């Protein structure tokens, strides 16, 4: 079944019906008028960030460094040879002029943490970037600015059917390939219930703390995640 969509729910409505019980929801009408929604093009990103060094994941992922200009030329526009992903980078601490184009969702103030401790990551890459099914240790607002993303969500109650890796460093990551699972090795995965959605520009997906999520970009995509408690 699909993640529910609510237009600008009250802080109390969000707190009681989603944050406290830990239920995913897509928030409409919240981020859809942030300046990033109309301003962020490849052209704007190149103008404001082109010459800055960014970390890039190259898909068995390896990690390298290059300028934003280099990243767009090699992994976005010029019939890329491999998949490059400007992933989980605090681009707005590096480039404060870009932080003017976003805000922190008001719903974050329902958390128990300081606003200064909210981690804001950029997720900028071509069509076809894929995450492993994984869980994070904080709440998350994932804001879609450019393009769409297909996302699959499994509650923490279903962890047993997701076969987490046995190593400590990877215990938060599933061994299963969500979209082509090995049911001979991971048979419990097939009957695990889940929510899914296509997240589109202007929309905010609330991923509850420790909720397992899987993310595949359907187009050239730019997302901003807010990790908060």
Q: How far is the CB of 197 from ligand HRF (least distance, A)?
A: 13
Binding mask 117-136 for ligand HRF (x = CB under 6 A): ------x-----xxx----x
- Two tokens at 193? 């219930």
Binding mask 39-78 for ligand HRF (x = CB under 6 A): ------------------x---x-----------------
Cβ contacts of residue 147 below 8 Å, gap of 6+?
Answer: 127, 201, 217, 218, 219, 220, 221, 222
Q: Which of residues 137-156 bind ligand HRF (CB under 6 A)?
A: 140, 142
40 is in an annotated binding site: no
Whole-number Cα distances in Å, 191 to 45, 154, 156, 197: 42, 11, 15, 18
210 is in an annotated binding site: no
Q: How far is the CB of 173 from ligand HRF (least distance, A)?
A: 10
Q: How far is the CB of 134 from ligand HRF (least distance, A)?
A: 7
Site size toward ligand HRF, by CB under 6 A: 14
Residue with tokens 């767009």: 72
Q: CA angle, corner 69, sides to 65 and 75, nearest 5?
A: 70
Q: How far is the CB of 73 from Mn ion (least distance, A)?
A: 27
225: burial class by Cβ within 10 Å (0-12, 13-18, 19+)? Answer: buried
Whole-number Cα distances in Å, 197 to 15, 68, 116, 214: 21, 29, 30, 11
Q: Is 136 in the site for Mn ion (CB under 5 A)?
A: yes
Cβ distance to ligand HRF smaller for residue 135 or 184: 135
Whole-number Cα distances in Å, 66 to 40, 41, 146, 165: 20, 19, 22, 31
Q: What is the Cα–Cα distance from 116 to 122, expressed in whole angstroms?
A: 17
Q: How far is the CB of 88 from ligand HRF (least distance, A)?
A: 6
Positions that interact with Mn ion (CB under 5 A): 136
Binding residues for a protein: 57, 88, 131
Binding residues: 57, 85, 88, 131, 134, 136, 140, 149, 213, 227
């Amino acid at each position: 079944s699909t993640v529910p969509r609510l237009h600008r729910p009250s802080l109390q409505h969000f707190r009681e019906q989603f944050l406290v019980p830990g239920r995913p929801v897509i928030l409409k009408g919240v981020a859809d008028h942030w300046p990033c929604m109309q301003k962020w093009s490849l052209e704007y990103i190149q103008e404001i960030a082109g010459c800055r060094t960014v970390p890039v994941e190259v898909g068995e992922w390896s990690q390298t460094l290059m300028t934003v200009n280099e990243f767009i030329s090699k992994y976005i526009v010029n019939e890329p040879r491999d998949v490059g992903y400007l992933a989980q980078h605090q681009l707005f601490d590096q480039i404060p002029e870009l932080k003017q184009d976003i805000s922190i969702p008001d719903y974050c103030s329902l958390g128990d943490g300081e606003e200064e401790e909210i981690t804001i990551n950029a997720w900028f890459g071509p069509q076809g970037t894929i995450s492993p099914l994984h869980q994070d240790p904080q709440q998350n607002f994932l804001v879609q600015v450019m393009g769409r993303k297909y996302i699959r969500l499994y509650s923490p109650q279903e962890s047993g059917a997701l076969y987490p890796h046995d190593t400590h460093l990877l215990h938060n990551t599933s061994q299963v390939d969500v979209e082509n699972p090995d049911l001979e090795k991971f048979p419990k995965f097939a009957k695990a219930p889940f929510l899914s959605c296509i997240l589109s520009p202007g929309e905010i997906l609330f991923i509850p703390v420790k909720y397992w999520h899987y993310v595949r970009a359907l187009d050239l995509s730019f997302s901003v995640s807010f990790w908060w408690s």
